[PDB]
């Protein structure tokens, strides 16, 4: 059982210096500060050590090339990462590494492994334990659950139960103290391959009452390649007392304008409301039931090779790697 | 027991037609179609019938002036409204009409009343039952629970349990088919204050990896009077490989720059991490544990009264009407 563990940094590797926690520790250190004696062939490697909120798109490319070269070398990979953008990393890796031959699992903790009442060891233990199950794909393991990477979302900013599988079932869960596989995500084909590319300049804006289209017109001028509007619920772009809908109608013919929802659960459905149909007709691309992190990283990923609106729309609505549920 | 029911619109006043749901029913008809007991005690009044997602800030002025003039003539007020912006309306109303003398409850439904299994009659009955309990304040009644308006947030775009009281407990809940009060908010004062003034032009931007401050400088140039950055976890502004921190450092001195979190539970804590402390140093205002809706609406309300930064900072940090929790 050859396991490779890559560190990216994160709360899990920090310590309360002068101005709050700051990522500090090596992967070998952390590794030992836990039940590393659960002897299986292991090996640590520090790719980086940053507070998660500093992670940028390039770091995902760096991490993906790394994994790519090693997918044949080990039986499974574990990545320690900061919780803040972990869902973004997991999602982007899922688009870049198609048909992974081995389980890749991202994990971290809410408190430094260097404290007590720390979730870090439990999380690492769950992550190692899952790779022994030989269930390939890209997942996140946290608080006793293993979730498909592109369906996971961080919904709590402080509690140990920080992640959730959104609109899709957990892959594994602790049952009577032992990981139990609840279901095996079967998207994965045979031939593995990397599709490492992306356009990072996209803008996410929350719709609020009275929002004008001015900020959308100007994002185009500033060079943004895609715009995601985080809407109210099931779907609709306001046109009452605002020029937002008028502005979206034409910007949507120049760069992809995606509509997702503020609500954590259920996704969007532009067929539900008449206001939603009108938006669909104006060129807006629905995000289905995808998590916010997979929507953002999938658009960046798609813009990595095309600027054609109809092709962006077709790819956004296609289930690439388990991120999206068959729409009616 | 004199109850006024004001209609604003929403899914509850709509009917699923050949184009999806759309406005169509007045308050009287919703009550008749819901089979609600009678109208000799209940006064039904339409203020407007606007489709779900189309509510604009000036509608709140109209609603607040109506309420203000009727709080001393009825024992309770129920407002039928769209779910998409209901929490913004409950929140804004709470800042505009402090210390109301009677219970004001907003309700709606996920399914039009003419659809099978509609939640509309149940939500309506719940609101009317809460109004007779004579517990003053502004609330949202939904799926058998009554929650403090300023603490409610819409977390589902389709499920019946669409609203949840965030970082604060339910005020009432159905138990043995009866509405039992779980706790009475007690931060109301003696005088009914009416402050119907606000600045609507604020902007909400989610923070994502790679995001530049260029869009933030552009928002100031466009006339935005405040900006909310939806951060990653407990709070922080990415200053690595991006000029976002640099731009926020200058912008925060001219207009308020508020930091909330993408997470829905636990809120912001700007002292926890190094990144968080640099943000505070940079002039960013923490939203604490407030709901996104309360945060947006309160910022708008404060800007209708002062443009002075430290002053805006004091008010955002002050618990005005139960929207936020102590030691911050």
UniProtKB/TrEMBL annotation, chains A, B:
EC identifiers of the protein: 3.5.1.1
Secretion signal span: none
Location of the Asparaginase/glutaminase C-terminal domain: 201-316
Annotated InterPro entries: AsnA_fam, Asp/glu_Ase-like_sf, Asparaginase/glutaminase-like, Asparaginase/glutaminase_AS2, Asparaginase_C, L-asparaginase_C, L-asparaginase_I, L-asparaginase_N
Gene3D superfamilies: 3.40.50.40, L-asparaginase, N-terminal domain
Class of the enzyme per the UniProt entry, highest EC level: hydrolase
Key words, A-Z: Hydrolase
GO-annotated molecular function: asparaginase activity
One Pfam family here: Asparaginase_C
Family named by the database record: Belongs to the asparaginase 1 family.
Protein name: L-asparaginase
Organism: Pyrococcus horikoshii (strain ATCC 700860 / DSM 12428 / JCM 9974 / NBRC 100139 / OT-3)
